[PDB]
Design a binder for this molecule. Structure first.
Ligand SMILES: CC(C)=CCC/C(C)=C/CC/C(C)=C/COP(=O)(O)OP(=O)(O)O
Ligand SMILES: CC(C)=CCC/C(C)=C/CC/C(C)=C\COP(=O)(O)OP(=O)(O)O
Ligand SMILES: CC1=CC[C@H]2C(C)(C)CCC[C@]2(C)[C@H]1COP(=O)(O)O
Ligand SMILES: CC1=CC[C@H]2C(C)(C)CCC[C@]2(C)[C@H]1COP(=O)(O)O
Ligand SMILES: [Ca+2]
Ligand SMILES: [Ca+2]
Ligand SMILES: [Cl-]
Ligand SMILES: [Cl-]
Ligand SMILES: [Cl-]
Ligand SMILES: [Cl-]
Ligand SMILES: [Cl-]
Ligand SMILES: [Cl-]
Lengths: 506, 517
């Protein structure tokens, strides 16, 4: 066909408004800017593709290019970083972005950025909030102009090829996008090349993925149907190697109900029954143990309580009227720095950032969101993130991704009261993509990032591998009794989170 | 309409049937081995039959090397509701009751005496396979061993059969399969392979005409050609193999050095499929080297030779060994240099690394490469070699190779070079075989560095075992230009300076892909 050179902003505004979904490229669209003096030679080398698909980090790609390009490793690095910093926002396109966002459009970002750079550009600029989904190559292990990434974007976002227009400066990228029935709009610094394209007619793993998802579902269903009081094993390592059956704590049952939403109704009913008949429930405060295992003077905790109450309220098993009293006791549990503490016992003073997150969640869920007493507790969690002190884990949660996950719930479900948490949190999660092997830690990152509007397909892929032949994933130690260093876990907890990660990316 | 198999009972006929076939495939368990499954331990709680552990699906993940026993047990600990420590006892008692089946192991020996083609196809977790290779002694009768843990493939998946036929170039017309599991026999029969079911007091023979006609090969031929092109282009532009230096095996932040001749020799010695023009081009660099005094080589070029840095034996051994094997030097000229090396022993009789009494030092790998030259020139029987050979042997038996050598920190490097010696002079190194081979088995897919993967792929293949796992994951780490990432093969221990090159890594990688094709 033949493009339609556009030079009138009025024409552009009318052309864009004819589409429900707009897809932006990053380079030259939204952002413009010893040996080899041209960085163009690095980006044109085949090894750069391995960097864009996340297969290797910049450090790897640099040393590999030092050899191929016959340039000192230090120089290629200094030039690459200088190129990154010099990136500037394109004011025209950023405004075209904010506009299409206030007009309630579907706006996705499809760029070929390496993970480390994308993590930097996410912290540098602020137009990221205008996107509904972010599809970066380093998090997909795909890259333009391979048709795979386009098919994945279409099926991932449920995009309709018609009413969808793609903006990019590369002809090959637009060329491929058009083969799927997407209208193209090439960005030249002077003008635009508009090419309307008829769309409507309808990835490459739905056959394999649907099978593993079914297998995993069947496994977890059987377990919880046989043990609605979620089982738990105990050891001294996060892998629960040589662990012994315990199954005398109620928190695991909560976590499952609070995280995996696709549970069949009969399991949810049966598991909910356990959360109610729990003999550790005095009033509407819960104890971690059953009475049969309660170690004598072991008090009730705000973590099991915050979850059980938050869940029951969200499922119409309690009224805010019944809960606010309990919530007020928690307000009275503040330590000398104004931080809500973990136990209903002034003689067991202990604080935990994740416990504070689940308490703060209940507060904002019941209307307590703006109580002046939560100030210190909220700042405690914010500093725990900003100071990167979450890498040392919480008192009872040693895995850093656990804190980021539960924080993402509070930040996504109450965005008005936690807007300053968004970008700092998403930066951390991006830098931690594929940084561990335990499937549960992967599922967490997969879920949290998606809720934050970023698709993490790397951890998703390597999650499918760690599934065992009976559908379930390996046991994992989610929380610990610190003084004795005792991990609690179960294959249910792991399979639950893994299944949700699969569902949230379907 | 169902086929009816000949009921064979006379062992006279059993050898009549088997004699008609060129290739025979044995299953390990219940054919060559048997064992007791039930063990009522001091628990009583839960499972009593190990048959239920092998019956569970999680066992498939163990058989395919995806998990180890400790992992598979803590999982079955939950599924079977049996304490972790009890399932471990049961498995150990089961393994300990393992015994040969004398009837079948004799069938194996006879078929090997008649110079048949015999292969072993069995599902065995990696840790158990390492154990069986040490416990029993019929492995010598196999022309090639295909174990699930070494393949990431298990029976009766048709894939594993298709891989066996492809890897071994098996002509299924004259091939028979001995197994007890009826479903493993059915799948083989659908490949044109005649079956023979092993029962108690009864063989079931079923002739299979066959004739009716792997699947990762297209991806493999492409990646092999790409790596070939990358290496030939690099070596043709720099026949003196370049090298980088840094503080880590990763060679991250590596500065160009390319003033050492060892990399050049290692590639000539290790990559067999090098194009001829490069072999000559690189060979010239070795002969016309700066630090070539007499017939003793120096690691550095004279421009980079530190003050009073002497000639070393590791370079001289390899260079001479290569020049001899390529008919570019006569044994008559090398034996005088070999005598200098025998005159280079320390208080304990171990051949030292340097031609310099002021720089005494020893290295098990350098000893290995020296002993290879000795046995290659007729010195194999010399008295003065005893202490040096034992030094290498204790290094292997004491599992001290796991801490690396003075100049080679990667253990797989020690095993690889020792496998050249053990395999190329078998009559002089029989006691090295089973220990060396079992060690390599326990290290399958134990590290991710491409070069280390190739070393295990090559060594295990020369020792008769096909390592497909490392083979697959080797194709992953291949960068988009064909070549593999850099890798630091040896070090300057005083300053902890690693040497390596993308040429080195790619060279071994291509060899490993070549040797399993
Ligand atoms: C759900 C959840 C993580 C709640 C927070 C606290 C809690 C009840 C955790 C579960 C396991 C446990 C008994 C920890 C305290 O051990 P300790 O015996 O070391 O007690 P201390 O350190 O608090 O005294
Ligand atoms: C692979 C090979 C050729 C091994 C034999 C010796 C050798 C020349 C190794 C390469 C690195 C080097 C030049 C010196 C290391 O010894 P140092 O300089 O660290 O001090 P040392 O010589 O006292 O150990
Ligand atoms: C092609 C290119 C060059 C350098 C590259 C870096 C500066 C190294 C990182 C940000 C991303 C980018 C600008 C990228 C754009 O990606 P695309 O917009 O083309 O997908
Ligand atoms: C699958 C299996 C069961 C138990 C197993 C052990 C006793 C644990 C170890 C030796 C090997 C073996 C007999 C093996 C035989 O392999 P197969 O002949 O069945 O393929
Ligand atoms: Ca671009
Ligand atoms: Ca069998
Ligand atoms: Cl009550
Ligand atoms: Cl505390
Ligand atoms: Cl804490
Ligand atoms: Cl025996
Ligand atoms: Cl030494
Ligand atoms: Cl040593």
């Amino acid at each position: 066909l033949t493009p339609e050179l556009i030079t009138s902003l009025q024409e552009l505004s009318q052309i864009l408004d004819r589409y429900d979904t707009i897809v932006f490229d990053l380079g030259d669209v939204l952002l413009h800017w010893k040996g080899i003096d041209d960085v163009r030679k690095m980006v044109k080398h085949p090894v750069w593709q391995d960097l864009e698909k996340g297969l290797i980090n910049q450090e790897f790609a640099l040393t590999a290019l030092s050899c191929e390009l016959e340039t000192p490793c230090s120089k290629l690095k200094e030039m690459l970083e200088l190129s990154i910093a010099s990136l500037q926002v394109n004011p025209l396109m950023v405004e075209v972005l904010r506009v299409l966002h206030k007009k309630d459009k579907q706006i996705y970002c499809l760029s070929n950025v390496d993970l480390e750079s994308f993590s930097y550009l996410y912290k540098q600029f602020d137009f990221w909030k205008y996107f509904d989904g972010i599809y970066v190559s380093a998090l997909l292990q795909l890259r333009k102009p391979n048709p795979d990434i386009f098919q994945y974007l279409i099926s991932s976002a449920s995009i309709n090829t018609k009413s969808t227009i793609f903006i990019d400066d590369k002809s090959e990228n637009l060329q491929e996008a058009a083969n799927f029935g997407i209208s193209t709009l090439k960005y030249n610094k002077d003008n635009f090349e508009y090419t309307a394209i008829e769309g409507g007619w309808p990835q490459n793993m739905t056959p394999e993925i649907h099978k593993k998802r079914t297998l995993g579902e069947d496994y977890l269903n059987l377990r919880l149907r046989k043990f609605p009081f979620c089982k738990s094993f105990v050891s001294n390592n996060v892998e629960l190697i040589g662990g012994e059956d315990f199954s005398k704590e109620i928190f695991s049952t909560a976590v499952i109900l609070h995280s995996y939403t696709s549970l069949p109704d009969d399991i949810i009913a049966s598991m909910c029954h356990e959360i109610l008949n729990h003999d550790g429930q005095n009033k509407l405060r819960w104890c971690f143990y059953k009475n049969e295992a309660r170690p004598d003077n072991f008090p009730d905790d705000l973590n099991t309580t915050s979850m059980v109450l938050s869940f029951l309220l969200n499922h119409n098993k309690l009224t805010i009227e019944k809960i606010i009293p309990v919530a007020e006791q928690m307000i009275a549990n503040r330590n000398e720095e104004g931080i809500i503490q973990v136990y209903f016992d002034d003689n067991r003073p202990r604080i935990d950032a994740i416990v504070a997150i689940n308490v703060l969640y209940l507060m904002h869920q019941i209307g307590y969101g703006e109580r002046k007493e939560l100030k210190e507790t909220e700042a405690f969690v914010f500093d725990f993130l900003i100071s990167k002190e979450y890498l040392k884990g919480t008192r009872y949660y040693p895995a850093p991704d656990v804190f980021l996950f539960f924080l993402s719930r509070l930040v996504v479900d109450f965005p008005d009261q936690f807007e300053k948490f968004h970008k700092p949190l998403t930066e951390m999660l991006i830098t931690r993509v594929n940084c561990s092997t335990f499937p549960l830690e992967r599922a967490l990152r997969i879920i949290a990032l998606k809720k934050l509007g970023i698709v993490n397909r790397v951890d998703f892929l390597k999650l499918l591998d760690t599934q065992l032949a009976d559908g379930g994933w390996p046991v994992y130690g989610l929380f610990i009794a610190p003084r004795s260093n005792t991990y609690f876990g179960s294959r249910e907890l792991s399979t639950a989170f893994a299944l949700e990660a699969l569902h949230i990316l379907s």
